[PDB]
Design a protein around this nucleic acid. Structure first.
Ligand SMILES: [Mg+2]
Ligand SMILES: [Mg+2]
Ligand SMILES: [Mg+2]
Ligand SMILES: [Mg+2]
Ligand SMILES: [Mg+2]
Ligand SMILES: [Mg+2]
Ligand SMILES: [Mg+2]
Ligand SMILES: [Mg+2]
Ligand SMILES: [Mg+2]
Ligand SMILES: [Mg+2]
Ligand SMILES: [Mg+2]
Ligand SMILES: [Mg+2]
Ligand SMILES: [Mg+2]
Ligand SMILES: [Mg+2]
Ligand SMILES: [Mg+2]
Ligand SMILES: [Mg+2]
Ligand SMILES: [Mg+2]
Ligand SMILES: [Mg+2]
Ligand SMILES: [Mg+2]
Ligand SMILES: [Mg+2]
Ligand SMILES: [Mg+2]
Ligand SMILES: [Mg+2]
Ligand SMILES: [Mg+2]
Ligand SMILES: [Mg+2]
Ligand SMILES: [Mg+2]
Ligand SMILES: [Mg+2]
Ligand SMILES: [Mg+2]
Ligand SMILES: [Mg+2]
Ligand SMILES: [Mg+2]
Ligand SMILES: [Mg+2]
Ligand SMILES: [Mg+2]
Ligand SMILES: [Mg+2]
Ligand SMILES: [Mg+2]
Ligand SMILES: [Mg+2]
Ligand SMILES: [Mg+2]
Ligand SMILES: [Mg+2]
Ligand SMILES: [Mg+2]
Ligand SMILES: [Mg+2]
Ligand SMILES: [Mg+2]
Ligand SMILES: [Mg+2]
Ligand SMILES: [Mg+2]
Ligand SMILES: [Mg+2]
Ligand SMILES: [Mg+2]
Ligand SMILES: [Mg+2]
Ligand SMILES: [Mg+2]
Ligand SMILES: [Mg+2]
Ligand SMILES: [Mg+2]
Ligand SMILES: [Mg+2]
Ligand SMILES: [Mg+2]
Ligand SMILES: [Mg+2]
Ligand SMILES: [Mg+2]
Ligand SMILES: [Mg+2]
Ligand SMILES: [Mg+2]
Ligand SMILES: [Mg+2]
Ligand SMILES: [Mg+2]
Ligand SMILES: [Mg+2]
Ligand SMILES: [Mg+2]
Ligand SMILES: [Mg+2]
Ligand SMILES: [Mg+2]
Ligand SMILES: [Mg+2]
Ligand SMILES: [Mg+2]
Ligand SMILES: [Mg+2]
Ligand SMILES: [Mg+2]
Ligand SMILES: [Mg+2]
Ligand SMILES: [Mg+2]
Ligand SMILES: [Mg+2]
Ligand SMILES: [Mg+2]
Ligand SMILES: [Mg+2]
Ligand SMILES: [Mg+2]
Ligand SMILES: [Mg+2]
Ligand SMILES: [Mg+2]
Ligand SMILES: [Mg+2]
Ligand SMILES: [Mg+2]
Ligand SMILES: [Mg+2]
Ligand SMILES: [Mg+2]
Ligand SMILES: [Mg+2]
Ligand SMILES: [Mg+2]
Ligand SMILES: [Mg+2]
Ligand SMILES: [Mg+2]
Ligand SMILES: [Mg+2]
Ligand SMILES: [Mg+2]
Ligand SMILES: [Zn+2]
Lengths: 99, 83, 208, 99
RNA sequence: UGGAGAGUUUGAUCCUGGCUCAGGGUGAACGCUGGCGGCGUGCCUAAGACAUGCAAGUCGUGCGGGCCGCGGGGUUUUACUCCGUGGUCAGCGGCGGACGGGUGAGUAACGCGUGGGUGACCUACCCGGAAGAGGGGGACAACCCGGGGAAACUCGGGCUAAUCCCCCAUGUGGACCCGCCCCUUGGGGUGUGUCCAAAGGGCUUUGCCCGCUUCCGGAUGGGCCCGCGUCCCAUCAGCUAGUUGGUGGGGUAAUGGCCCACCAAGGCGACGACGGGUAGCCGGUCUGAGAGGAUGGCCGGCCACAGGGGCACUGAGACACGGGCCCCACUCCUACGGGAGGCAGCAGUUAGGAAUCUUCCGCAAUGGGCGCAAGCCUGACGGAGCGACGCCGCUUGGAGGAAGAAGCCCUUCGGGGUGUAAACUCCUGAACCCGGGACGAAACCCCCGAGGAGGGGACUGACGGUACCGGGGUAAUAGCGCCGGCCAACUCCGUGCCAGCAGCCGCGGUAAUACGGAGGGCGCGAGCGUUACCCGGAUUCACUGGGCGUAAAGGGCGUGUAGGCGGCCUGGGGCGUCCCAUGUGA
């Protein structure tokens, strides 16, 4: 079954493409305590319908481009920028680390 | 093509084939699609043969030329007898 | 194989009367009756309390020496003992007994085990028809530990047969003294056994 | 020394040419097709698009161009032809195309 | 069903804490020693260089000849020929050379493992189902002549065959453009237009077998794709021009920035990007109570490579270890123009290294390739060979024999110990000699039937006159480590901080159980020790299972980002979590 994922859209700046971020969770192989990690997926969106802050089902799909092997399935809830808030904040503390 | 043949096993001087369906290419003591019953050239035990004639029927059915000295243990093991 | 050297000598270190000798060890002289002390320049002086080591050690050397057997082989059996279910201390011993060259002793076809080995090894014995000569041969329950045809009327065979009349032996065994053959009833219970050895101490030493 | 695998080699040479040959005909006829196609002349465009289509499938009957690559050529070739004759023109002669 | 600890900081004590040992382990090596077999196993280093032999071919039932041996009728025969013909060695032609076999250099990556996706894919031969096979033409090798060349080879000129090439037809059907429905990523059906088939060969002839072509299915093998798992250094912190995405095209079996033109300004990163170091991954293996750690030899799977690098051709399949072109390095030949070669296949050489074998036997077995079969080649494989390298079985004897030999140690001068040990008697009988001697092999191939099912009928064994079986038959290899504590096992002499020992604590400066020799003892035995490395001990990285007032360890103090953690009660979903079945876990 073509694996599927809900993650929030996190960038629309692409032409017919969208960045989707998906926290999975699982237990640490030695320390058990469920830990949380996440990955960005490059979804396809030929209708350029989905905007930022959308939470979306994403399906494993025929390869569209170098990084796109998923397509947007369906919305799950519009207004949820608060999550993108986070992904942006995170991505901004970086700029204050270099030298 | 697919094949049905003896797959040697067990020590030196103590042969112990395994009558199996592999792809013609796979090496002898190789990986294989399935086991359809052991064999013994020496017959040290009363069980010096066996064959899941059921599935063997199948592989021949989906086409699968076996060895020659493997027919010698499909005939002499009753697979083609319909009467 | 067995330390061919001086043997009425071990009885002396362990300090227990051990029957590696046949007639003589029953006489006044297992080496021991005249000299009850350990070998060597000393040993006749006041010994010292064996560390928890020496004890677990010497007890092992006892039960091993009793069978005059390969350390690697022993060691192996000890481990095989843990391999299977039950009380390891017993089966170890029970397994020791299954050893063919030990049966031709419990069945007395010879005065010693070392003697017993000779005959077994020399094809003098047999089992269910075949001339087994592998001292190792594990006797399963219920098998004619007979004597071979060329062998029946043998010099040192009979001298042990005519001496083997009567005298009950082994609840886990049975001897057709006439037909010259025995049976392995079952696997020697612990109670059925009686050796100068604490099995529990030998396990200890086999943990180091 | 002489492991007569050479026969295999000499063979390949003879082969190489033979389908190199068939293959270039594909191309040049194919071009001379799209050519006359765009230019305007339709009955002529198709008339060439014909021995075009032919020469393709013909190369297919052997070790040369094969599989649906024999098709992919047509699927685009005539596909381009139609589109160009389409430029103000009209399906003049009953070419290899169905109207 | 499984978990032990010891020595050593002090005058002594408890604690903290290092160090150290006993265990098991190996593709081992080195030392002293070394009898027998069985099954395993053996270049870890220079992916350094290789002499010689052998490792992939096969079909005369695709075709035509060079050659060669046998035979004959027909014509009274001569000229003989054609065919039957078998053998050849080449050529065209077909299938195989991508499997098998070697090795881990590279590779930190969809490479591997694991579980899925392909409506985005191919798949020779095999199996199943449908359809069809009508006619016509041509080229090039062999061969003949000529030419150049040291060789390697090669240029030209002229014939010829075919299951080689090509053309028109028939189109079951299939490919494509567009249109329609169903479906839903490029899946399925239909319509109109165009396009594409084919090869003969055998025998026992009124026929069957081996083949051909189109098409659909089947099976097997594979491409591609994704979630997840997969090493050290943050004293590597920022990285990115095909870079990220779009549109159209090229390419492919097929998706994709895989490649190109055009546009957009993106993509990645402390959840560790980028760099550097290191390394084939796995089933497994070692160790450990276990969680864990270490590991990937042999065997099986996957990957990658074939002196280094690049390339494409042929092909269902490779950019192909024993195919091709190019460059570089290296070796050889040369008539100086030129040419040949690739063991990380088996075996063997040399090199380096502490170190790794026979240039054996055989296609009998199993397996593969071609073939209608007979059969041909198969250093895969089946065996044999050499090294205690490993595991396992066996042997060097069995019984009896002294208050107890001789010798040699010790001694309070009575004695003690080696020691039943030896001697001696008897019994057994490895080795050795004689005889007999396979299993591994019943199939393909022969008659009945029908070349099928079914029965029956014969050949074939390298190992090997070995295994094993019977007869005769000789008492017939022992060695190494240790003996102060941990740690089993004491004394005598020599030595005098010298000679030397050592894992640690330490020992030896006249009285050494610590050095060396002896007797004796302990351990283990065809082995015993040493060194190396992995796990254990080490609860000494602590999840299991640790700490921080003074023993090592609380940031000098706040404030807060991310992150982690979160009170009471009702309800919805059910993500974790749990349970059941099912596929998978070769
Ligand atoms: Mg047990
Ligand atoms: Mg129980
Ligand atoms: Mg245990
Ligand atoms: Mg000290
Ligand atoms: Mg052998
Ligand atoms: Mg190597
Ligand atoms: Mg012929
Ligand atoms: Mg001929
Ligand atoms: Mg044929
Ligand atoms: Mg000929
Ligand atoms: Mg003439
Ligand atoms: Mg002629
Ligand atoms: Mg091999
Ligand atoms: Mg290797
Ligand atoms: Mg790296
Ligand atoms: Mg990966
Ligand atoms: Mg990954
Ligand atoms: Mg996979
Ligand atoms: Mg799976
Ligand atoms: Mg029909
Ligand atoms: Mg012709
Ligand atoms: Mg012709
Ligand atoms: Mg035509
Ligand atoms: Mg039709
Ligand atoms: Mg046609
Ligand atoms: Mg036609
Ligand atoms: Mg034709
Ligand atoms: Mg043809
Ligand atoms: Mg024709
Ligand atoms: Mg006829
Ligand atoms: Mg790119
Ligand atoms: Mg621009
Ligand atoms: Mg590497
Ligand atoms: Mg490396
Ligand atoms: Mg584990
Ligand atoms: Mg590793
Ligand atoms: Mg690893
Ligand atoms: Mg290797
Ligand atoms: Mg290997
Ligand atoms: Mg391997
Ligand atoms: Mg190369
Ligand atoms: Mg090389
Ligand atoms: Mg190369
Ligand atoms: Mg090749
Ligand atoms: Mg190549
Ligand atoms: Mg080679
Ligand atoms: Mg010269
Ligand atoms: Mg010269
Ligand atoms: Mg010249
Ligand atoms: Mg040159
Ligand atoms: Mg021969
Ligand atoms: Mg063969
Ligand atoms: Mg050979
Ligand atoms: Mg040696
Ligand atoms: Mg050695
Ligand atoms: Mg004396
Ligand atoms: Mg004396
Ligand atoms: Mg004696
Ligand atoms: Mg004696
Ligand atoms: Mg005598
Ligand atoms: Mg005998
Ligand atoms: Mg004879
Ligand atoms: Mg016949
Ligand atoms: Mg003989
Ligand atoms: Mg003979
Ligand atoms: Mg042998
Ligand atoms: Mg004999
Ligand atoms: Mg002591
Ligand atoms: Mg001195
Ligand atoms: Mg002294
Ligand atoms: Mg002292
Ligand atoms: Mg001393
Ligand atoms: Mg010492
Ligand atoms: Mg640990
Ligand atoms: Mg630990
Ligand atoms: Mg803790
Ligand atoms: Mg602590
Ligand atoms: Mg403070
Ligand atoms: Mg709730
Ligand atoms: Mg509910
Ligand atoms: Mg398992
Ligand atoms: Zn005694």
């Amino acid at each position: 079954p073509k694996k599927v994922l809900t993650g929030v859209v996190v960038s629309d700046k692409m032409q017919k493409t969208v960045t989707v971020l998906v926290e999975r969770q699982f237990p640490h192989p030695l320390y058990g305590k469920v830990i949380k990690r996440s990955k960005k997926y490059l979804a396809h969106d030929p209708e350029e319908k989905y905007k930022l802050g959308d939470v979306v089902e994403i399906i494993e799909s025929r390869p569209i481009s170098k990084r796109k092997r998923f397509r947007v399935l369906r919305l799950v809830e519009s207004g949820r920028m608060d999550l993108v808030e986070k992904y942006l904040i995170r991505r901004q503390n970086y700029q204050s680390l270099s030298k | 093509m697919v094949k049905i043949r003896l797959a040697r096993f067990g020590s030196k001087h103590n042969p112990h084939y395994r009558i199996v369906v592999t792809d013609a290419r796979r090496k002898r003591d190789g990986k294989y699609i399935e086991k359809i019953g052991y064999y013994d050239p020496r017959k040290t035990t009363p069980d010096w043969l066996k064959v899941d004639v059921e599935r063997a029927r199948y592989w021949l059915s989906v086409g699968a030329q076996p060895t020659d000295t493997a027919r010698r243990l499909l005939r002499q093991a009753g697979v083609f007898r319909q009467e | 194989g067995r330390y061919i050297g001086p043997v009425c000598r071990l009885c002396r270190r362990e300090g227990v009367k051990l029957y590696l000798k046949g007639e003589r060890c029953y006489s006044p002289k297992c080496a021991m009756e005249r000299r009850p002390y350990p070998p060597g320049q000393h040993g006749q002086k006041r010994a010292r309390r064996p560390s928890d080591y020496a004890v677990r050690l010497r007890e092992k050397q006892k039960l091993r020496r009793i069978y005059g057997i390969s350390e690697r082989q022993f060691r192996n059996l000890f481990e095989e003992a843990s391999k299977k279910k039950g009380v390891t201390g017993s089966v170890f011993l029970g397994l020791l007994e299954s050893r063919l060259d030990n049966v031709v002793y419990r069945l007395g076809f010879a005065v010693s085990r070392r003697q017993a080995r000779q005959l077994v090894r020399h094809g003098h014995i047999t089992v269910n028809g075949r001339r087994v000569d592998l001292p190792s041969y594990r006797v399963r329950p219920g098998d004619e530990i007979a004597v071979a045809e060329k062998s029946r009327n043998l010099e040192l065979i009979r001298q042990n047969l005519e001496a083997m009349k009567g005298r009950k032996v082994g609840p886990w065994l049975s001897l057709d003294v006439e037909g010259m053959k025995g049976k392995f009833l079952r696997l020697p219970d612990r109670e059925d056994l009686a050796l100068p050895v604490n099995e529990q101490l030998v396990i200890e030493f086999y943990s180091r | 020394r002489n492991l007569s695998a050479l026969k295999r080699h000499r063979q390949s040479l003879k082969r190489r040419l033979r389908n190199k040959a068939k293959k270039s005909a594909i191309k040049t006829l194919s071009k001379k097709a799209v050519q006359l196609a765009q230019e305007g002349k339709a009955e002529e465009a198709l008339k060439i698009m014909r021995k075009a289509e032919s020469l393709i499938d013909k190369a297919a009957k052997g070790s040369t161009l094969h599989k649906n690559a024999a098709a992919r050529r047509k699927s685009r070739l005539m596909r381009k032809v139609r589109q160009l004759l389409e430029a103000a023109g009209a399906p003049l002669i009953g070419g290899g195309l169905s109207a």
